[PDB]
Amino acid sequence: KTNERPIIGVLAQDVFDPKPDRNSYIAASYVKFLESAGARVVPVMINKSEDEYSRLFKSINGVLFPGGGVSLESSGYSKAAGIFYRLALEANSNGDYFPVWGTALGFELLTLLTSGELLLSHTNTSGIALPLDFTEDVKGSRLFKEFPEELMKSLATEPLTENSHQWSITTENFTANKKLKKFYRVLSTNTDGYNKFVSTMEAYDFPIYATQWHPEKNAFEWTRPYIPHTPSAIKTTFYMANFFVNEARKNLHSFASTEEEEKALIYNYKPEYTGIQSAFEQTYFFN
Amino acid sequence: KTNERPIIGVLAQDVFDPKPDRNSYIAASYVKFLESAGARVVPVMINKSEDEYSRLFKSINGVLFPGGGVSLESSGYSKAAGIFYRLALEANSNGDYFPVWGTALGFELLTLLTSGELLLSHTNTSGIALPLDFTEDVKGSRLFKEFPEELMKSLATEPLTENSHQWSITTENFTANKKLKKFYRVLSTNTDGYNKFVSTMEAYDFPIYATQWHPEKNAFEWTRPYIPHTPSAIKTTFYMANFFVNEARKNLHSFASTEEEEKALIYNYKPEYTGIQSAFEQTYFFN
Amino acid sequence: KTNERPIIGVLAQDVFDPKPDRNSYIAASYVKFLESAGARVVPVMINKSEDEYSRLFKSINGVLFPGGGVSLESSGYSKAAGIFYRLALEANSNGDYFPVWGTALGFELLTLLTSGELLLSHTNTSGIALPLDFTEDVKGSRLFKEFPEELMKSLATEPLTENSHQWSITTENFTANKKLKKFYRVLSTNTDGYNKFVSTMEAYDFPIYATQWHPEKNAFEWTRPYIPHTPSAIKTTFYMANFFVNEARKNLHSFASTEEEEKALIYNYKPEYTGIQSAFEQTYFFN
Amino acid sequence: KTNERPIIGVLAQDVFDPKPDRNSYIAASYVKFLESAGARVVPVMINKSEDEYSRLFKSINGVLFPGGGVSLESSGYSKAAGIFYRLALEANSNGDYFPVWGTALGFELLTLLTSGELLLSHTNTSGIALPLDFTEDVKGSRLFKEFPEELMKSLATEPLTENSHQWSITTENFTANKKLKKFYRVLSTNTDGYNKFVSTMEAYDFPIYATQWHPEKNAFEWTRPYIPHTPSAIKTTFYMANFFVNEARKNLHSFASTEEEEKALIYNYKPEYTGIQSAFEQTYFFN
């Protein structure tokens, strides 16, 4: 039994200098990321109650934690992500399949949510494109199981992944942490020349996937000269999202009514053109 | 040399009872189709001068003629399309490479642009999912060259293609037309139970590609229960777009300035939520 | 009265995981940068006494503080740079001319040493080639007075300057610091998204010059695809170095004997080939 | 179409009292001359086979024949030079640009390679700085086409060129040799007070340039008090090298693989400090 109309949540995050109708945002490339693989998208708002998130959680089929620059500890974003993370562990544990994806900031958050500790250190990775240095465990992985061979070889040898993060979790800090070592299979690592860090990982026992890099940029962001845009960079963004949405199709939650489904969808919101200056071509702002 | 920043135009279409800011439209699924294979999009307005279309044509890297309900002979859409068609035939003849894509109404328009005649017949195909019946000629073909072998087997045997057309050209009328027979390679056909019609074609000597069916619907349109949304239907939409945007990467046109590029991009426009009532989840309306 | 045998010191910086004979290092591109403009170079070791540094200061004609990855307050590099900075202000205040150059990390240190504060902000500039957005003040600047007008034009319009840092001082923060504002003339800025940052400056009242970017990379480092290597990128590195060595030729210091001079020169050291792996083709490692 | 990663060979020459690891040498000033104009350098070993020289020749983008004191007729140097000269004449004649630079001894070698005869006579120029006495033919020359007007004036009137040769070809012996007069355009002459000799030349029909004097010495050698080290002497070394490296960028040769490229580079070798004693501050010795 499969859900061919998956709806996935994307978490909004705190705007730095917030105003009314401008309290949180979502970069449109994360919306496009998921839509292209045949999902619809609901924005998850920031300063809501446990019950409101619980109602939405039970309605949607997966959730993505996007990149950005807010606090992993004290932000509306971190708090809402922690609520989704416990709900997802509950559901999966009970036997309902519910996938979670973390990108950049979202990857960092997951290391903090699962280990209890802030384990991040500085890496020179603020706007650089890298290949993936796959680990010994990529072989039987879930994430990359459905990628073409030629694409796997291009990922290993071509600079296909966009990194814009001032922090990483070194492989040394990761491996020294008992909780993370047991919880997550590391699929790729990378180096800035000085420190080797985790770049792609998936939970052993849960459908939880995370990248330190930004798969959604290659097809959808054109603002910066280090964003990969070769043909295999484009297929990378499709195959990454294809895997995740195929995860969401294993989840059978639905909204109570088509009416409530219709009001929650991203189609209710119009993004602003931010690409003349911002790293993001388009950005959704929310009250 | 290839162009790793392709920009493709999508033709806007006359609104049936037009009002200011609502004289023409583009369904957002055509925009999402192109962006997802790593292209940016420019809307091509309907009531412009020959010189303005020339200037736009010389700035962008390909064009798409979308489906819809407008006149093939007397609409602003049909006029603009004829101008782009003629500019494309000139550029390619001279040795530039400029690709043209027609979908559904746009496929029908191309049969008329090339043959000079309307040769369409009624088919009982106004809302149905169909496989494709490939011709022997699919083996040499340009369009399907990079499709995975399993995806080609799935298109042959599974209902992955969205048909929503009341008209078609039967294979018999296509064949009896000397101009069409000489200009286009037929790649797939289909039947409505009574009439066998051309569903996919490409020009022998030009990068002009057309489908009677709607490849953009599978991943981006959720308004009708017949629209295919299986995992291989999602891959069909990506491989179709990936081929076309790879053709556009062979074209080296650029805008005269980045400020002029920035003003033309679809990012400057905000679509309306039309999915509760119309065939399209979102629609861009233009003055 | 000029010194046509200038010798310039280049400060070594702390090796992260130091070992005997590998306590500090200098990228060879900084040596080559100064030699090509007709200077000899002395490496300035870290973790030496005040008196040793004062002896060396009194013998050489100028000093460069090179880019790199070390801490701004606790490194042997930062403490030696503070010493040379204080010696240079004393000598210039007294009436002796002694020029100081800071590149990247060096530029950072200069803002700290003069302001007494840490004013850096994050920018996605870990690997990007940028033009310079000159200020009105480049006009009668000392640094650029002798550059060819065409080179100045190329510099304003082509990506000729290598950036590989991730912390910059924004123009707002520079202007808001009274001590920096009164001390340094900003010659060029660049923009990372919304953040406009100081990229080249020179002290109003002292021969102290600093670039956020790496002039020495264009001619000498071949390890990353974005490093500028066009003909005008090559002339930029020569003219930048030529200006600074022409500053050192105004200083009349010499070593107490030709034997002491000979033992201090970089010719006593052999670099390692570090290019297959690191950002530098060659590096000098020191005990 | 240009090569922005040019690599140029520098010929090593026979050590006089040869020993293992000391059979040939290159003075580091030739390597520095070229790197400063944005080339990488490969040392060309002396006792190699014709096939080995062919393989290298086809991988590199130009070659320089340095000065020195080895036989023009029986050395490993003069043999390797003959092979490169013949390969370069072949390549240029076929339509493949390949530039050759001779300095001092290398200039004398070229007069022998092209005329078939030794036409040199003693001049009193073993260690003196001279201006260049330009011919009428400098005006449309290739070598000096991009030099600043003011530098060409300084070269005419200031002692900017290092002469350290006891042999020269007089302008009278030059002119009387039919082969030389038809193959080379004389750009400058000089006199020792009794003999007027050729000091700079370029081939009319090939990219072959030669100086009797040593452009590389002004910026990089500090062993003799005659060596010119004024600002404009420093610019002379940069502009000479700049010309020749720009010639090498017209050559599209590459190595078969990056690994083979990496093993051939001068970065693999370390020079010795020879400055206390010899004409050269630093020298590369080879087995």
Ligand SMILES: CN(Cc1cnc2nc(N)nc(N)c2n1)c1ccc(C(=O)N[C@@H](CCC(=O)O)C(=O)O)cc1
């Ligand atoms: C929306 N519509 C009804 C329709 C048509 N013309 C109108 N014209 C006006 N002035 N006002 C209207 N309300 C109006 N409505 C349509 C839609 C498609 C086709 C049509 O023939 N489409 C092609 C292409 C199919 C496709 O592209 O979707 C076909 O073969 O069916 C005709 C009318």
Ligand SMILES: CN(Cc1cnc2nc(N)nc(N)c2n1)c1ccc(C(=O)N[C@@H](CCC(=O)O)C(=O)O)cc1
């Ligand atoms: C160092 N030296 C002495 C010298 C020459 N040949 C030798 N050959 C052998 N086998 N062994 C020696 N010890 C030896 N020594 C030299 C140096 C330059 C010239 C010479 O004629 N050079 C050219 C080129 C000038 C230059 O390139 O510097 C000239 O015109 O003077 C001759 C002898």
